[PDB]
């Protein structure tokens, strides 16, 4: 380590063999064949020797004295061997290769894209979601000289959006699914368009845009090209989103759509659907099993311990009470809803200001007047 600072002998032979070919006058197939023989030699090495030789190969190829016709072909050939290597080795070589290509990145755009797709796949396999997404975001889909086909761009934005959802970053996921939305209609790949629709619905769900997600999931449930088991899974997602949605006209219209769909009787949450659709006041105990039916992100709680479902039930209960009574004190309204009177007033006041409940509040006497 300290006094003998040079590299491995076999990596030195590779570096040497490549330096000798740099200004060769030989024909393309002969010259490319000699570079390929050196690549096969470098690939047959086993550890630090292999890593060093493969780096010497990339460094020789990016050299401006090697014609692009050769370097593009051999860098493509080089890339085909890297997925067969251990992930830690392939990762190091992919990053090294992107770094060494950077000064001539416009000339090697095809190779950069291939490397970024393979490198992102390693980060994905290791659940390093943010690094995987960033690697794909670095592919120049619109800033390069290559005119990428629509489906390549759509597949890449969908992958980025899915990776950001895995990273619990729905705002970034939405930013990229929105770029995919501009392409999806120009695509002729129906399965990819359905994958896009599913991702878009998931992104809306993660963003707590529950009624928008419910509508998209419901529409997926109607697609006869989708297997029956997955149409029922889409319907279940639509139902859960509708229950979690903020109380009002759009939500009540979706509850009516779902209640009229006979398939909802195959879902465990049918009982809750019926009660919500009928504008019933829902008790805490009636939703414990439903709360256990939810996805992790749908169970988020604030510092006070309040969950998404807790707040949705309070809004639903307040709107339902507004249809039963002409007026009521907050003490009674709180006692009927099993919440403090101050919370009943605060949420009722918000729904009135937002236009979701018609009526007015008498703050001194603590009474809400409906209609
Ligand atoms: Cl390539
Ligand atoms: Cl971007
Ligand atoms: Cl997805
Ligand atoms: Cl269909
Ligand atoms: Cl069905
Ligand atoms: Cl909502
Ligand atoms: Cl179910
Ligand atoms: Cl269910
Ligand atoms: Na009323
Ligand atoms: Na208010």
Swiss-Prot record:
GO terms assigned for molecular function: deNEDDylase activity
N6-acetyllysine found at: 34
Alphabetically ordered keywords of this record: Acetylation, Cytoplasm, Cytoplasmic vesicle, Nucleus, Signalosome, Synapse
Alphabetical list of Gene3D superfamilies matching this protein: Winged helix-like DNA-binding domain superfamily/Winged helix DNA-binding domain
One biological process term in Gene Ontology: regulation of protein neddylation
SUPFAM superfamilies on file: Winged helix' DNA-binding domain (SSF46785)
Domain PCI: 206-371
Positions where N-acetylalanine occurs in the chain: 11
Subcellular location: Cytoplasm; Nucleus; Cytoplasmic vesicle, Secretory vesicle, Synaptic vesicle
Name of a matching Pfam family: CSN4_RPN5_eIF3a
Taxonomic superkingdom: Eukaryota
GO CC, alphabetical: cell junction; COP9 signalosome; cytoplasm; cytosol; nuclear speck; nucleoplasm; nucleus; synaptic vesicle
Subunit structure as annotated in this protein's UniProt entry: Component of the CSN complex, composed of COPS1/GPS1, COPS2, COPS3, COPS4, COPS5, COPS6, COPS7 (COPS7A or COPS7B), COPS8 and COPS9 isoform 1. In the complex, it probably interacts directly with COPS1, COPS2, COPS3, COPS5, COPS6, COPS7 (COPS7A or COPS7B) and COPS8. Interacts with TOR1A; the interaction is direct and associates TOR1A and SNAPIN with the CSN complex. Interacts with STON2; controls STON2 neddylation levels. Interacts with ERCC6.
Protein function: Component of the COP9 signalosome complex (CSN), a complex involved in various cellular and developmental processes. The CSN complex is an essential regulator of the ubiquitin (Ubl) conjugation pathway by mediating the deneddylation of the cullin subunits of SCF-type E3 ligase complexes, leading to decrease the Ubl ligase activity of SCF-type complexes such as SCF, CSA or DDB2. Also involved in the deneddylation of non-cullin subunits such as STON2.
Similarity annotation: Belongs to the CSN4 family.
Matching PANTHER family: 26S PROTEASOME NON-ATPASE REGULATORY SUBUNIT 12/COP9 SIGNALOSOME COMPLEX SUBUNIT 4, COP9 SIGNALOSOME COMPLEX SUBUNIT 4
Protein name: COP9 signalosome complex subunit 4
The organism of origin for this protein: Homo sapiens
Taxonomic classification: Eukaryota, Metazoa, Chordata, Craniata, Vertebrata
């Amino acid at each position: 380590n300290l006094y003998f600072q040079g590299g491995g002998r076999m990596a030195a032979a590779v570096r040497q063999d490549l330096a000798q070919l740099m200004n060769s006058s030989g024909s393309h197939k002969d010259l490319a064949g000699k570079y390929r023989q050196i690549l096969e030699k470098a690939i047959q090495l086993s550890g630090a020797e292999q890593l060093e030789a493969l780096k010497a190969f990339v460094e020789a190829m990016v050299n401006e004295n090697v014609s692009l016709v050769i370097s593009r072909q051999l860098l493509t050939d080089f890339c085909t061997h890297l997925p067969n290597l251990p992930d830690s080795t392939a990762k190091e070589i992919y990053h090294f290769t992107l770094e060494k290509i950077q000064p001539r990145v416009i000339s090697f755009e095809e190779q950069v894209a291939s490397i970024r797709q393979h490198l992102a796949s390693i980060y994905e396999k290791e659940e390093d979601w943010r690094n995987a997404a960033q690697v794909l975001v670095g592919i120049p889909l619109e800033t390069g000289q290559k005119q990428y086909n629509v489906d390549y761009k759509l597949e890449t934005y969908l992958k980025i959006a899915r990776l950001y959802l895995e990273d619990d970053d729905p705002v970034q996921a939405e930013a990229y699914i929105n770029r995919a939305s501009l392409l999806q209609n120009e695509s002729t790949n129906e399965q990819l368009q359905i994958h896009y629709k599913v991702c878009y619905a998931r992104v809306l769900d993660y963003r707590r845009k529950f009624i928008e997600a419910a509508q998209r999931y419901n529409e997926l449930s109607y697609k006869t090209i989708v297997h029956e088991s997955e149409r029922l899974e889409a319907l279940k997602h639509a139902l859960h989103c509708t229950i979690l949605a903020s109380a009002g006209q759009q939500r009540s219209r979706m509850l009516a759509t779902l209640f009229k769909d006979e398939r909802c009787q195959q879902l465990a949450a049918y009982g809750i659907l019926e009660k919500m659709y009928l504008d019933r006041i829902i008790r805490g105990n009636q939703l414990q099993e439903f709360a256990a039916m939810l996805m992790p992100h749908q169970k988020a709680t604030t510092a006070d311990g309040s969950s998404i479902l807790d707040r949705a039930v309070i809004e639903h209960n307040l709107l339902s009470a507004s249809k039963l009574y002409n007026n009521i004190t907050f003490e009674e309204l709180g006692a009927l809803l099993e919440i403090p009177a101050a919370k009943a007033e605060k949420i009722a006041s918000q729904m009135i200001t937002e236009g979701r409940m018609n009526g007015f509040i008498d703050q001194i006497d603590g009474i809400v007047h409906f209609e």
